[PDB]
Amino acid sequence: GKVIRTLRLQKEHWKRKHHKSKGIVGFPTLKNCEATVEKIVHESGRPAPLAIINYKKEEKNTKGLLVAIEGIYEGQKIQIGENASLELGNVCPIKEIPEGSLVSMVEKKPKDGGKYVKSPGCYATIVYHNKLTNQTTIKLPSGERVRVTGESRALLGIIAGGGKDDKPLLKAVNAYYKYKTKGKPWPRVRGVAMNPVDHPHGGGNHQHVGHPTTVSRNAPVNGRVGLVAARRTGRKKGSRKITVN
RNA sequence: GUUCUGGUAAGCAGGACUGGCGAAGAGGAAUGAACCUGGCACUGUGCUAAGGAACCCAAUGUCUGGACAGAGACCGAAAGA
RNA sequence: CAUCUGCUCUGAAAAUUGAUGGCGCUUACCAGACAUCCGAUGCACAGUUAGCAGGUAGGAGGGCGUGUGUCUACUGGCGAAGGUACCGAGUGAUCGGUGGUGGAGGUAGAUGCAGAGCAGAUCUUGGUGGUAGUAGCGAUAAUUUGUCUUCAGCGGCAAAGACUGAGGAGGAGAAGGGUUUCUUCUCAUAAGAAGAGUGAGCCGGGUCUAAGCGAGUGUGUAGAAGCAUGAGCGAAGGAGAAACAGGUUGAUAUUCCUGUGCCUGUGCUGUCGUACGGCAACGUGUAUUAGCUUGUCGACACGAACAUCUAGACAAAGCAGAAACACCUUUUCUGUUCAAGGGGAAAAAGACCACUGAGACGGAUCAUCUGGCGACGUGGUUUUAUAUCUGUGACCAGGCCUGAGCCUGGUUUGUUGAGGAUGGUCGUCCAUGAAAAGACAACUAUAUGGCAGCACAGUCCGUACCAACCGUAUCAGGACUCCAAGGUGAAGAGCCUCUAGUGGAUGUUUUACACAUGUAAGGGAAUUCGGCAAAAUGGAUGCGUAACUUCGGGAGAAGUAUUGGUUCAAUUGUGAACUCAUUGUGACAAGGGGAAUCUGACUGUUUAGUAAAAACAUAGCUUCAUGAAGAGAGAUGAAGUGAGUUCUGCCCGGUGCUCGGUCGUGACACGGAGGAAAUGCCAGAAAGCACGGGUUAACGGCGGGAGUAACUAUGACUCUCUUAAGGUAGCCAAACGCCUCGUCAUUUAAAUGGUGACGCGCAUGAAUGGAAUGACGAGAUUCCCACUGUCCCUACAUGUAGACUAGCGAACCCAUUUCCAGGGGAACGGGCCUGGACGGCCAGCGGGGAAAGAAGACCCUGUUGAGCUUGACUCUAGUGUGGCCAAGUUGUGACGAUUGAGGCGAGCGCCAUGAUCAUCACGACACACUUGUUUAAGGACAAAGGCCAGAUGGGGAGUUUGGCUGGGGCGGUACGACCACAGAAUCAGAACGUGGUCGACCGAAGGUACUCACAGCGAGACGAGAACACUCGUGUAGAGCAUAAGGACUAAAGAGUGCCUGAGUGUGAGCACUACUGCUUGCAUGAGGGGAAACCCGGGCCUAGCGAUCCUACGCAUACGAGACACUUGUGGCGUGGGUGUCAGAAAAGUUACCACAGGGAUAACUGGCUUGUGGCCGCCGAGCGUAGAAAGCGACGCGGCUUUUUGAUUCUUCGAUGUCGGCUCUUCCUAGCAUGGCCAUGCAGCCGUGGCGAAGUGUUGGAUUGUUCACCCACUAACAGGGAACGUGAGCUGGGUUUAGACCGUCGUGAGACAGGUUAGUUUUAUCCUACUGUCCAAACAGUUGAAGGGAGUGUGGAUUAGUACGAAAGGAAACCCACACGUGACCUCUGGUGCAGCGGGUGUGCGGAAGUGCAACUGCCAUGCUACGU
RNA sequence: UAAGGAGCGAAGGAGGGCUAGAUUAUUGAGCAGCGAGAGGUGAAAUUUGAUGACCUGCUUAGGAGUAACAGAGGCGAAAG
Ligand SMILES: [K+]
Ligand SMILES: [K+]
Ligand SMILES: [K+]
Ligand SMILES: [K+]
Ligand SMILES: [K+]
Ligand SMILES: [K+]
Ligand SMILES: [K+]
Ligand SMILES: [K+]
Ligand SMILES: [K+]
Ligand SMILES: [K+]
Ligand SMILES: [K+]
Ligand SMILES: [K+]
Ligand SMILES: [K+]
Ligand SMILES: [K+]
Ligand SMILES: [K+]
Ligand SMILES: [K+]
Ligand SMILES: [K+]
Ligand SMILES: [K+]
Ligand SMILES: [K+]
Ligand SMILES: [K+]
Ligand SMILES: [K+]
Ligand SMILES: [K+]
Ligand SMILES: [K+]
Ligand SMILES: [K+]
Ligand SMILES: [K+]
Ligand SMILES: [K+]
Ligand SMILES: [K+]
Ligand SMILES: [K+]
Ligand SMILES: [K+]
Ligand SMILES: [K+]
Ligand SMILES: [K+]
Ligand SMILES: [K+]
Ligand SMILES: [K+]
Ligand SMILES: [K+]
Ligand SMILES: [K+]
Ligand SMILES: [K+]
Ligand SMILES: [K+]
Ligand SMILES: [K+]
Ligand SMILES: [K+]
Ligand SMILES: [K+]
Ligand SMILES: [K+]
Ligand SMILES: [K+]
Ligand SMILES: [K+]
Ligand SMILES: [K+]
Ligand SMILES: [K+]
Ligand SMILES: [K+]
Ligand SMILES: [K+]
Ligand SMILES: [K+]
Ligand SMILES: [K+]
Ligand SMILES: [K+]
Ligand SMILES: [K+]
Ligand SMILES: [K+]
Ligand SMILES: [K+]
Ligand SMILES: [K+]
Ligand SMILES: [K+]
Ligand SMILES: [K+]
Ligand SMILES: [K+]
Ligand SMILES: [K+]
Ligand SMILES: [K+]
Ligand SMILES: [K+]
Ligand SMILES: [K+]
Ligand SMILES: [K+]
Ligand SMILES: [K+]
Ligand SMILES: [K+]
Ligand SMILES: [K+]
Ligand SMILES: [K+]
Ligand SMILES: [K+]
Ligand SMILES: [K+]
Ligand SMILES: [K+]
Ligand SMILES: [K+]
Ligand SMILES: [K+]
Ligand SMILES: [K+]
Ligand SMILES: [K+]
Ligand SMILES: [K+]
Ligand SMILES: [K+]
Ligand SMILES: [K+]
Ligand SMILES: [K+]
Ligand SMILES: [Mg+2]
Ligand SMILES: [Mg+2]
Ligand SMILES: [Mg+2]
Ligand SMILES: [Mg+2]
Ligand SMILES: [Mg+2]
Ligand SMILES: [Mg+2]
Ligand SMILES: [Mg+2]
Ligand SMILES: [Mg+2]
Ligand SMILES: [Mg+2]
Ligand SMILES: [Mg+2]
Ligand SMILES: [Mg+2]
Ligand SMILES: [Mg+2]
Ligand SMILES: [Mg+2]
Ligand SMILES: [Mg+2]
Ligand SMILES: [Mg+2]
Ligand SMILES: [Mg+2]
Ligand SMILES: [Mg+2]
Ligand SMILES: [Mg+2]
Ligand SMILES: [Mg+2]
Ligand SMILES: [Mg+2]
Ligand SMILES: [Mg+2]
Ligand SMILES: [Mg+2]
Ligand SMILES: [Mg+2]
Ligand SMILES: [Mg+2]
Ligand SMILES: [Mg+2]
Ligand SMILES: [Mg+2]
Ligand SMILES: [Mg+2]
Ligand SMILES: [Mg+2]
Ligand SMILES: [Mg+2]
Ligand SMILES: [Mg+2]
Ligand SMILES: [Mg+2]
Ligand SMILES: [Mg+2]
Ligand SMILES: [Mg+2]
Ligand SMILES: [Mg+2]
Ligand SMILES: [Mg+2]
Ligand SMILES: [Mg+2]
Ligand SMILES: [Mg+2]
Ligand SMILES: [Mg+2]
Ligand SMILES: [Mg+2]
Ligand SMILES: [Mg+2]
Ligand SMILES: [Mg+2]
Ligand SMILES: [Mg+2]
Ligand SMILES: [Mg+2]
Ligand SMILES: [Mg+2]
Ligand SMILES: [Mg+2]
Ligand SMILES: [Mg+2]
Ligand SMILES: [Mg+2]
Ligand SMILES: [Mg+2]
Ligand SMILES: [Mg+2]
Ligand SMILES: [Mg+2]
Ligand SMILES: [Mg+2]
Ligand SMILES: [Mg+2]
Ligand SMILES: [Mg+2]
Ligand SMILES: [Mg+2]
Ligand SMILES: [Mg+2]
Ligand SMILES: [Mg+2]
Ligand SMILES: [Mg+2]
Ligand SMILES: [Mg+2]
Ligand SMILES: [Mg+2]
Ligand SMILES: [Mg+2]
Known part of the structure; x- marks a missing residue:
């Protein structure tokens, strides 16, 4: 036969375009900064809003992008790096933040710029600090628990734009606008x-x-369709999760 | 043509024996691959075959019995007056 | 009288008109005989001749002709070759001469070399017919008259008549074309030839950047591709300095000329400048370069309402010129202009500044709203149009003259108003709606800078025209945009007009059949598969509106009434009166409505060119995988179901997917033992597999048999077999039920239909989704109201073609000689044999030419394909798994490999610990390697490469998927062997002919020598019987002989008993159609057997139990061995085993309804032919029955025929094509007689019947369900018989069924897919030829006639009278003449319907100034003559 | 007013909402010790254990609850 839809849409001319992008999202690299929030903006493909920040590096003004947490405003001054206060919208080393706190945009290793929690309405929970190994355990929004070193940075708050999935898309045209910028086939035959x-x-x-x-995990690519490497199937109840910090 | 097997049978399917048409014209059965007479270079005079002999159409008449049905010369059964 | 033989007779019925061959024959027949004649390519005689002589497929001998070679002989301007008429020679292929034409070459003999002879190939190329002066050439607005040319153009010009009707048939640009544009000449004409024509600083290109492309460089490759970075490129409609009027040419113009300007720079001469004002909001001042930095401009979605401006359009008054005047009218028409640049208001809408100090309250919009973060008020500051003026006069209208110049006007007001422009508000979004070049301000430095005049500069390329573009063209198709008047009306709708633009194949009143349209008495779906087509309804205003529902809707539900003109009131609500001959959304424009069922929620999408759908999509619902990202779980991908409401039961046995451990297996490497070494051997061994768990909104699956309740039925209850679990809730003869047209109710006069019920449901059923509704379908189906030419049953009229005529002018097709009946024949003839008939012409028509299209698509065959599937065969990319490969460095412990000095149990193995090399985790450093944490972080791990080895692998690749066969498939095996039967008494001998057997068995069931029988029957012998052991007599096999069938055998070949392993070893010859195989037989040998010996034995009493080449295993002796020699491996020879059953021997699964190719009438699906079982019809006999009684009527059990209208059986004709079921329409034939006419019998009183005879003239209907033929009901009737003609009839129609490609359901299949199972949507071409048939002319001067031959026509019902009579116990109950009617036939318009071309009238919208006369769109009342039936 | 509503003073109660904490217990995982049974009943079988159960240590992860004190005690319109 011929090549299936799933393979064709993975070729290079089908990758998402960047022409309307604002820039690369991520923290500054410097040990300490004072920044000002210049503008809060929508970016064409993304539902969470972005904040443009301004900070001095040597004498020169320089610009960056963060994902906006809920409760900032245009004109606000924010403090980045070591010696920042625990105030909403500041960026701090993780070892300084108390247990039970909610954080976003967490670095997986120092100076990576922030990965982890970035979608609307999401947050992570700080579940343990180990004073010997200098590790910290964070609970991710999938339920997964992961360990990160105390030197990593994180943003204090919840990502803006939550609640979006409450309102049903009642019409075909409403779905059209949502999937127009995504890689999935719509309409799906x-x-x-x-x-x-x-x-x-x-x-x-x-x-x-x-x-x-x-189907098997090791099946050939042009026929790997259906439920790939499923452990079980159907609507019945599962089993207890096993947990360690 | 003479015989045989399967089948209700068939211008049906399948064997055996002796001549044909296939690859065979000519004269005769009104017409017909195979039936009757009889096997072909080219001419001329006579004679016969098979089949014919009122007329179509070359050659026909005679004797003795039957037979009356728009019958027969071409043509069907068991049963009958 | 009884039998037998001959001829006649009865049994004896088929579809166009018919066949002893015809006409005829009764003295042309039947049977027995007799005369002699006619008749072959045979026979006789005679010529010619080698004479011995037919011939397909095939084989051989001798000759004739063509182009060129070598030689010999000749020839031509006193006319060669060729070509054309005649004449001679040869059996023939061919050859020779003579007379005209032609104008320069040509042969005869013998040999040599070949591109060496045509009727055919749906042959190739070129040229020409018949058809034929024929078919056709005419959709659209329309044309007439005069006059000139033209020389014979509806060409040009005047006057009329029309049309497109401002979303034009008008005026312009782009893409595309390329001189098509202008002048002259000529026909050569959608034709040529010769010239001429396109002018820019301000219009567009050359500039900037989008999505994107990319040279080079790096990495890679045999070279490439690819990947990283990146000079340059990327928009004639995005961004982008600066121009407008009026004139001029045959053709250009914001480009030329005149006038008035502007942008960017350069230079001269003058003339001024180096700062201030306002509480403030900010102003006055035309101001230089340069640079950081911060900001602005360039720079932006859709939708709605409201303001203001400008085009445009109206109406009054003034003047100038036009139109109209039998009458009337200050009626009607055209005009009244002002660019860029410069100067510039009031207004409206927003911002802001000073004073002031406001509320359970003021302000303000069409609408939101707004204020102590400062309301109302009073004074200011600023941003954004437009009117008006200047632009120095141009331009227009009119008058006077004129081959030129003068003169006069261009004045005022009101209403409205964009389909263009602008402003500030409001709404929508899980959608927030480009960049860059180039500019500007503030801040900091620095200063000869501003303005006026005059002068200079601004390159290169495009510029004509389009009705001329793409479709083979002068083609009703296609093709990006801009501007846009008046009336009617909601409306750039339809209809009518102004500006501007437009047109030819000729004449004829022109039948029939057509194609576009009108109208119709009475009836109203009776029509048809089906209301298909048509009719009916229609705008606005009011009254009045149901079930159900997700509460939004349904809804314009349904049902009803009103509507013109005039003259008034009243001011948006509307009222009232008067008036008209059919009445008023008058023309044009403009919904039919209701009750139910199946199905998909909705708007949306699809097979360009036969399918628009129930199919796809969709919102919502559920499952799965992942912490990897330029993306980060409200994420990113993969599947299934299909909105909402309500539910979603049970099963993990099989298949898959997933999780855990090894107990076993399982590669290469790495080790070990041995040997001189190779080859082998042993260990070792991840992942997989096996084994144990999980999982159905994974693939899917979800039972049988017996009994049992106070009538009968049914079984809550019991028992029994069985499993992974035995179909829960619901729903149903449903788009799913075979039987089946299921049963009951309702709808109709009548229901193979519809709806409601019922349910052991061939084969319903739960996200392979089950069930009940709303709103919405060009979806499928049934009924009712309205309405009608669909129909009864057709008639009349209009336009356009058609007939005839002038001008112009083809094609398909074609072996052609073509009137029928019967016969035969390749089984349906135009041509052959025997009869009946025989002409040409013009216009129609569809019986025949199995008419033309196209090497049948269905079906079979081919050792021909291709798409798709998987549990087919053999491989492969990707994905996983192991060991090895770029010398990282140094610690600790550990198991393991190799050998000593310790200890235990009658030097052994077992237990202690001490030295020698690898080596697996764990640490801690930095050097390889990795990453934009990069003056950095990780780190010998990862990630990325390389060489070998296992596992998985329809993701792909190649290929295969036997034969015979009363066509193929399914079934059997007639595919290799053996016996019997038949095949007309040797042997042989076919069929899916008949009765059967084989793929083995046995140390004896083999070899030998000797002994004796057997199966039974008749007597005996205790228990002991039908049947126990023992005896005597008979006993030709009645028994046995392992295993089919036949043959064979008696002191044996059978049953016993003894001994043996001949079921030896070498090597020959033969038989069975004789290779393999089986058997028969010769010679030589054995320290062979059995027997006294003669004799016998190298398997089974005889006929069946079986297999090549190459490779490999074993036995036997004799060989070979590479320069030489020794050994371990190897190679030769003979013979046996391991095996091919498709058995004289390939290594092999399906499907195609998406389909291709070569062929086949060697072979199926129609008709015809032969046959007639089966179907139908008729005879013979007489057992019984009929109230007696064989035979009025019947007629058992048996027996003989006919028919082709049923279905079989067979395969002769057609596969380079004979259009396949039913209906509609129309004609003819048959008889086996239903009615109607004449008769005979009767168990015939009469009435009504029943059985038969001669007879085929005239009749045999209207409907309901169903695609039906068939069936079954209702109504009428004199009666509602049965059939044939290629299962009559598709270039006559129709297209409901069947039978291509889309899609649903059930059952089958792992799947692709199947199903004489159900359902829905699905292109019907061409006559102009010949012949037939129907009419028309000629053959036939004119007037009056004749009648050969051919055609043929009237059929039936009722009433009255005989008569309440005959006849009958009664009840009942018949038989001419006359009159009325129906169907059929032939005519006719006096009457009555219908039609409206000629004729007279009326109204609506808009044109010609009014009235009168009238166009266009079309509507409407009456109606001559004529034609017609619903009339006579 | 030994009728009602407003208010003052000192005090009492498991009356209600919110914020931040807590001692044990029942399950589940990790690791260590030991080496054969545990569970359940009137009496037993399904069942689980050499892939080491049971019992005893140490670590952890969750989600409920407030024993004894506790009563013919208290509070609330009732439910509580
Ligand atoms: K998408
Ligand atoms: K032949
Ligand atoms: K012969
Ligand atoms: K003859
Ligand atoms: K014959
Ligand atoms: K004669
Ligand atoms: K005759
Ligand atoms: K005779
Ligand atoms: K030829
Ligand atoms: K030939
Ligand atoms: K018009
Ligand atoms: K733009
Ligand atoms: K000029
Ligand atoms: K417009
Ligand atoms: K031009
Ligand atoms: K108008
Ligand atoms: K109007
Ligand atoms: K208009
Ligand atoms: K209009
Ligand atoms: K009907
Ligand atoms: K029907
Ligand atoms: K139709
Ligand atoms: K309700
Ligand atoms: K309705
Ligand atoms: K009306
Ligand atoms: K109309
Ligand atoms: K639909
Ligand atoms: K729509
Ligand atoms: K449609
Ligand atoms: K499909
Ligand atoms: K599913
Ligand atoms: K879905
Ligand atoms: K549902
Ligand atoms: K299972
Ligand atoms: K399973
Ligand atoms: K299945
Ligand atoms: K049930
Ligand atoms: K059913
Ligand atoms: K029925
Ligand atoms: K019914
Ligand atoms: K089923
Ligand atoms: K089912
Ligand atoms: K289910
Ligand atoms: K499905
Ligand atoms: K539709
Ligand atoms: K006419
Ligand atoms: K004409
Ligand atoms: K025949
Ligand atoms: K025949
Ligand atoms: K014939
Ligand atoms: K013919
Ligand atoms: K015709
Ligand atoms: K014809
Ligand atoms: K380190
Ligand atoms: K380093
Ligand atoms: K470091
Ligand atoms: K394949
Ligand atoms: K056969
Ligand atoms: K035997
Ligand atoms: K050698
Ligand atoms: K050598
Ligand atoms: K073999
Ligand atoms: K074979
Ligand atoms: K298909
Ligand atoms: K047949
Ligand atoms: K055929
Ligand atoms: K048909
Ligand atoms: K009769
Ligand atoms: K008749
Ligand atoms: K047809
Ligand atoms: K499928
Ligand atoms: K005369
Ligand atoms: K006559
Ligand atoms: K009349
Ligand atoms: K009339
Ligand atoms: K007109
Ligand atoms: K409290
Ligand atoms: Mg596939
Ligand atoms: Mg002959
Ligand atoms: Mg003679
Ligand atoms: Mg020959
Ligand atoms: Mg040659
Ligand atoms: Mg010459
Ligand atoms: Mg040749
Ligand atoms: Mg004609
Ligand atoms: Mg018109
Ligand atoms: Mg118009
Ligand atoms: Mg138009
Ligand atoms: Mg021209
Ligand atoms: Mg320009
Ligand atoms: Mg460029
Ligand atoms: Mg532009
Ligand atoms: Mg021009
Ligand atoms: Mg301008
Ligand atoms: Mg031009
Ligand atoms: Mg009528
Ligand atoms: Mg009427
Ligand atoms: Mg009918
Ligand atoms: Mg219709
Ligand atoms: Mg229903
Ligand atoms: Mg639709
Ligand atoms: Mg189509
Ligand atoms: Mg269609
Ligand atoms: Mg669907
Ligand atoms: Mg649903
Ligand atoms: Mg619910
Ligand atoms: Mg049905
Ligand atoms: Mg019907
Ligand atoms: Mg029903
Ligand atoms: Mg489905
Ligand atoms: Mg189903
Ligand atoms: Mg004939
Ligand atoms: Mg063919
Ligand atoms: Mg073909
Ligand atoms: Mg073959
Ligand atoms: Mg193939
Ligand atoms: Mg191919
Ligand atoms: Mg396989
Ligand atoms: Mg075959
Ligand atoms: Mg024996
Ligand atoms: Mg022997
Ligand atoms: Mg063979
Ligand atoms: Mg045949
Ligand atoms: Mg018969
Ligand atoms: Mg027939
Ligand atoms: Mg044909
Ligand atoms: Mg043919
Ligand atoms: Mg035909
Ligand atoms: Mg008769
Ligand atoms: Mg027929
Ligand atoms: Mg026909
Ligand atoms: Mg149909
Ligand atoms: Mg189909
Ligand atoms: Mg359709
Ligand atoms: Mg008239
Ligand atoms: Mg343990
Ligand atoms: Mg307590």
């Missing part, structure tokens, strides 16, 4: 409605799959 030249689920005198939909 079902594999059982294709001919066998186009998809492993195609063909036959009734619309059916005909073979089990759970």
